[PDB]
Write a protein that binds this DNA or RNA. Structure first.
Lengths: 222, 222
DNA sequence: TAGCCTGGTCGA
DNA sequence: TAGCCTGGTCGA
């Protein structure tokens, strides 16, 4: 790939990796669902290489004790964890802008505590007492859900139908039922649908459909 | 310590480690808060040693690539994670029985979905339409909370004042306010109170106080 | 396969 | 220091 000069030394930020990765996308596959999965794959491959230049030398020369091993073990695991999550946020932000969805707030304050990944169409409209509450949207983003999905709930007391975007290779049917009852709606990249139980597949939204719904919903907003 | 014979080979269960660990407790420090922290420390030290006999040899001879390193790295990290959590559950179960708290359900079904770590005084009383709902208690257990605490919420729709037991070395004041509003009440081992902000320390329960409250609350139940 | 998190890194 | 989880192990 040939990386930027100081990357060998200083480990780049999430936006920096992607900023570099952008000049290496396949192009075009103008479907938003295709684009995400592709941009993720390209970004990840670059990340793998940067990671190697920081650890591979330490990896080979072994560890004298468990406490030594596990410190870097946790450090490296948790580097991936923190960066994987921010990556998906960023990739969706870029895709919203590129596909006509300009009406969204990134760091939007709702009730004063929890702040959702994405709020629609505005932080302002959300507090606007005369904006139709049923036209409000919220997008929580989780690369994997597992048990962690329930942490997304009351991020927007005002919105009961909440959207969760995830890359998980199938959510259990039992687990999906809990999500429905709690008012959660999955947005999942078209390609990953086949990993979800047949009964669930029907109620699954693609990224493309999400963007299209919201684009029309807020077309009448400046 | 000298471990049981087959431990070198087969990695023991959580109950097995503790069953062995019990014959190695300090004794007595009859305070429940003291006993937990001690039994945890004894259990952990044994765990560390069992872990070493399974990994130390693999740890020293290094790794050829990142993908090799990270597989065991995640495996070992996640062994600790799964076992740490079950350990605390077990230690509290044993302490409840030993200190007169016989009225609790371990695997209690509430609404049919989420099942709380501990339900009081009975799975039956919880569904008993004439048991005073304000005398119901529920105990979620988390070794560390972090962001994960919000996953404990609606485990018992019927109970609004919920108890969370944790070993975390201080919960932020901002984070504690969210817990209060969501109807969560911390139970924290006496010794760890000094790690919590001064403003929070006041509303913190000890294990001893928890057991004493519930013991009196259910003394009139067979 | 639901729950665990003997948890450090990243970027407001 | 709040949010992340490019997540596998354990035991119903």
């Amino acid at each position: 790939y040939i990386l930027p000069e100081d990357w060998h030394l200083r480990f780049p930020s999430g936006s920096e990796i992607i900023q570099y990765a952008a000049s290496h996308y396949v192009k075009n596959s103008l479907d938003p669902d295709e684009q995400l999965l592709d941009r993720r794959r390209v970004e990840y491959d670059i990340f793998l290489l940067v990671e190697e230049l920081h650890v591979l030398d330490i990896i080979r020369k072994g560890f004298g004790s468990v406490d030594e091993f596990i410190a870097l073990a946790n450090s490296v695991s948790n580097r991936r964890k923190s960066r994987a999550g921010k990556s998906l946020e960023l990739h969706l932000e870029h895709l919203f802008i590129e596909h006509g969805l300009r009406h969204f707030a990134t760091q939007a304050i709702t009730e004063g505590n929890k702040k959702p990944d994405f709020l629609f169409p505005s932080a302002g409209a959300y507090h606007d007492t005369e904006f139709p509450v049923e036209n409000l949207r919220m997008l929580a983003v989780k690369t994997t859900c597992k048990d962690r999905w329930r942490q997304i709930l009351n991020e927007a007391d005002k919105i009961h139908q909440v959207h969760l975007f995830t890359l998980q290779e199938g959510v259990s049917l039992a687990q999906y039922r809990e999500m429905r009852e709690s008012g959660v709606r999955l947005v999942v990249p078209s390609s990953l649908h086949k990993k979800y139980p047949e009964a669930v597949r029907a109620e699954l939204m693609t990224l493309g459909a999400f963007i299209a719904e919201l684009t029309g919903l807020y077309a009448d907003i400046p």
